[PDB]
Amino acid sequence: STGSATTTPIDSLDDAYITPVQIGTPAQTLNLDFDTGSSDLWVFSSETTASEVDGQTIYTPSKSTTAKLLSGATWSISYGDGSSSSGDVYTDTVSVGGLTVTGQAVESAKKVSSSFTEDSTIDGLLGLAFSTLNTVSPTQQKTFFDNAKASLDSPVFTADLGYHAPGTYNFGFIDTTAYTGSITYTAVSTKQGFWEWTSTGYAVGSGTFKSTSIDGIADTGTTLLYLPATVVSAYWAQVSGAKSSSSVGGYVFPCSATLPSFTFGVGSARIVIPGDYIDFGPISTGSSSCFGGIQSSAGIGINIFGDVALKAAFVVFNGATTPTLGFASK
């Protein structure tokens, strides 16, 4: 089997991407944030505290003839941005782009933090990291990809995120029309539960490539590109007037600037992020200070190849017995 679904930016900045997901019988379609940095499929639901729902579409398990309470199971998750959610668990039929999993753990939110409430466009998350990170207790649950894997034509999914445009998540096949050149594959460590890999270096604009190992995670659920402070300083030093602002929370730059590109290495191959992809617009409405799309990871503990980086590539998440990542230009 295979699946193919379009993923759409939630706003004009590509702050996140939503993909429609069918849950239950008859189908209830919710728009989920596919997140290769986490491993829980959770939704706003009929159980979510009413004051914490503000425009989201909710899953109502009592209206699904295939929903079953997973008795005793609870979940609770905290994300790197400080947001969180928690609740109980049903199993139900879940379909993405024509690919159906029966018995998928659907984690129903009883509580969500304010940033989720405040984002009316995201009805939940669909985790695509390794199932060892799944938070369901006392019986850990498998991700959608893990449950689908054996049925897929090939044990892979691909992320093809658009810049200010829709893109595609495919399951079970590699669309050879969706990229240029060849796909370069690189090793993955699953020791932290992430799609963790080592970039071979970087360049700023037309500058020379610096060969240096940068360990980080391919994370579709993170908006920006978070890299070591040395690398980020070298980038922003090429933008007149750019500075790190403690009050804003990162590097800002004059909105009148033209940003240089940023290149990252995948083995001997190179992925070029155009400068425009690094512009996240005014820090507040009407400001001439703009927020940068490349930020320091120094306070995180891990480097994160988020959407800014991934949207410049066609990315293969290869879930073979020994997982690997593939990157191609497009």
Please describe what this structure looks like.
- This protein has 330 residues and is mainly beta.
- It folds into two domains: 5-174, Cathepsin D, subunit A, domain 1 (Beta Barrel), CATH 2.40.70; 175-330, Beta Barrel (Cathepsin D, subunit A, domain 1).
- It contains four helices and 24 strands.
- The chain has helices at 114-117, 144-148, 229-236, 307-310, and strands at residues 3-9, 17-23, 28-35, 41-43, 68-78, 84-96, 99-112, 124-127, 156-160, 167-171, 184-187, 196-204, 210-218, 225-227, 243-245, 250-254, 262-266, 269-273, 279-282, 289-292, 294-296, 303-305, 314-318, 324-328.
- A seven-stranded mixed β-sheet has the order 18-17-12-13-22-14-21. Strands 2-3-8-4-7-6 form a six-stranded mixed β-barrel. It has a four-stranded antiparallel β-sheet with strand order 15-16-20-19, with no helix packed on it.
Strand content: 35-45%
Shape: globular
Distance between the termini: 25 Å
Structural class call reads mainly beta
H and E order:
EEEEEEEHEHEEEEEEHEEEEEEEEHEE
Helix content: under 10%
Strand order of the largest sheet: 18-17-12-13-22-14-21
